[PDB]
Amino acid sequence: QVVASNETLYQVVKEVKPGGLVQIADGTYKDVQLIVSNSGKSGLPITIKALNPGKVFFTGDAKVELRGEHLILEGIWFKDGNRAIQAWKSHGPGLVAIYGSYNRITACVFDCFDEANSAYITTSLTEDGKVPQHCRIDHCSFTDKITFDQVINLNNTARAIKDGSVGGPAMYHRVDHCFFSNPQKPGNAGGGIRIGYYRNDIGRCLVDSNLFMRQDSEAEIITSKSQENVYYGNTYLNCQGTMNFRHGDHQVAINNFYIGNDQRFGYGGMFVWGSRHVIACNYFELSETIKSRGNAALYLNPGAMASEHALAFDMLIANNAFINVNGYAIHFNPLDERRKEYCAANRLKFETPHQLMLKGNLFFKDKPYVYPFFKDDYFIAGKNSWTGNVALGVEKGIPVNISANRSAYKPVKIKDIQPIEGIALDLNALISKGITGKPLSWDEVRPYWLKEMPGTYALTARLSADRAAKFKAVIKRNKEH
Ligand SMILES: *[C@H]1O[C@H](CO)[C@@H](O[C@@H]2O[C@@H](C)[C@H](O)[C@@H](O)[C@H]2O)[C@H](O)[C@@H]1O[C@H]1O[C@H](C(=O)O)[C@@H](O[C@@H]2OC[C@@H](O[C@@H]3O[C@@H](C)[C@@H](O[C@@H]4O[C@H](CO)[C@@H](O)[C@H](O)[C@H]4O)[C@@H](O[C@H]4O[C@H](CO)[C@H](O)[C@H](O)[C@H]4O)[C@@H]3OC)[C@H](O)[C@H]2O)[C@H](O)[C@H]1O
Ligand SMILES: CC(=O)N[C@@H]1[C@@H](O[C@@H]2O[C@H](C(=O)O)[C@@H](O[C@@H]3O[C@H](CO)[C@H](OS(=O)(=O)O)[C@H](O[C@@H]4OC(C(=O)O)=C[C@H](O)[C@H]4O)[C@H]3NC(C)=O)[C@H](O)[C@H]2O)[C@@H](OS(=O)(=O)O)[C@@H](CO)O[C@H]1O
């Protein structure tokens, strides 16, 4: 039914049956506490949407909880929030918290909501430990987040100082066609998306066709902290950070675009920890790279095997293209001094990247940047395997013989890569095709009903005066008195 007030919405949501449709009349729903515990069924979801997307606003001290299964939340604009700062925490439920499986949040706008620290959307475990699976977050816009924690957290374990061989279960969520543009916070402040927490966690989440444009929240654009997540066809434009395989072996990144097109800040880029990954057909063209990380497009982590800062080794880096990167194309030992400290403290064995299969990559430069293509201060003949790559435009920086014949360049055919269970993508086919398409634009991911890109940061790298004042207050209360 159509509802026009918080009270009537609360009532209809308690009565709605599978296949039901709840439509919210044009208006502002201030301090709305939407809790949906009922469930739809496969083929008969329950849909809660704005009757006219773009005309419904959830504001004030609001909260949405999707506890039932087979629910769809659509066309809501979240703004002008006012949740209690003493009542929300990073690592807790998001403004929208998804506790049930088979749920979808689509075509929603989250714009500088408020000053309470938390994610904008989370999949969250219920108190009895049940983990939501098979959810989808798509065609949503997340802009000007001025609070700590990631924009989205996909959880399969409760936060804990951890380290027991037990890990969270596979989630099988998908985050697609979302837009992310958010300002830089200080320190380990929470980035764009976090999936899982530690290496024993299994993710199997698909993150595809998203546009991160000045997603600058913190060092990590995405901190992928679980095994077997697949990142396909995402565009990272002028982002002050790197997309990371932080924890969890056997992760996949195929055909993503990492573009930096001005000199305003250092951009990224990928920082990789762990082994057995598949990093293929990605395109890196970065006008400026990140000094603090080591000035590179692809950073391969040195350290102790399978540790808290797991050594990057035994993986396939294929058919990628590094075009005019103003930094190293690949840095084989970033932050090595800190990693030696971590290894010494825990009495672990410090090692450097090896057993890498670098096949069919193109390294090209025709702009006056000064960086050789590679940095490997621990180079050892034969530790890595290089085949079918092409390098031209600047010295390589390491003693490896690579063809300089650009005209003869061709991505390599690969057919031995196992697909990820639960994710319908033919990795062999995609990798063998080489790099397809081009960077995604706002019109390719925007909510169907929204023409104008929201936010003040994406196009300017600066929050408007009002939002900057609120951001300043959030930052100040989170630090030392
Ligand atoms: C993420 O998305 C981006 C694009 O936004 C992709 O970007 C490309 O790749 C990047 C690497 C590059 O950077 C970029 O530049 C691009 O090159 C990126 O790869 C990712 O792709 C994934 O997401 C896509 C997305 O969601 O946009 C996926 O594409 C969709 O795939 C499904 C397609 O649907 C099928 O085709 C449509 C037209 C329907 O079929 C037609 O149905 C008509 C009516 O029945 C019929 O008359 C016609 O004969 C059919 O052809 C659809 O059918 C289904 O729906 C219809 C109703 O519309 C009926 O109900 C049917 O019963 C039902 O089956 C088809 O389903 C197979 C969709 O069009 C397409 O957009 C992509 O596959 C992902 O990999
Ligand atoms: C516990 C843990 O390992 N967590 C990791 C997390 O590691 C943390 O990374 C930060 C970082 O932002 O790099 C790091 O803090 C930085 O440490 C350096 C020294 O190594 C500087 O500290 S200082 O020596 O006291 O100055 C640095 O400060 C910056 O110094 C300089 C300069 O002189 O170059 C200029 C700057 O103005 C000043 O800010 C400091 N940065 C900050 C913001 O304080 C922590 O020590 C480190 O624990 C990350 O992993 S890692 O790969 O970056 O090492 C994170 C992934 O991004 O993952 C967590 O698990």
From Swiss-Prot:
GO terms for molecular function: chondroitin B lyase activity. Glycans are attached at residue 209. Changing residue 247 to A: Partial loss of activity. It comes from the Bacteria. Keywords: Glycoprotein, Lyase, Pyrrolidone carboxylic acid, Signal. Its EC number is 4.2.2.19. The active site is at 225, 247, 308. The keyword Glycoprotein applies. InterPro entries: Pectin_lyas_fold (IPR012334), Pectin_lyase_fold/virulence (IPR011050), PL-6 (IPR039513). It catalyses: Eliminative cleavage of dermatan sulfate containing (1->4)-beta-D-hexosaminyl and (1->3)-beta-D-glucurosonyl or (1->3)-alpha-L-iduronosyl linkages to disaccharides containing 4-deoxy-beta-D-gluc-4-enuronosyl groups to yield a 4,5-unsaturated dermatan-sulfate disaccharide (DeltaUA-GalNAc-4S). Changing residue 225 to A: Complete loss of activity. Cleaves the glycosaminoglycan, dermatan sulfate. Monomer. Belongs to the polysaccharide lyase 8 family. This is Chondroitinase-B.
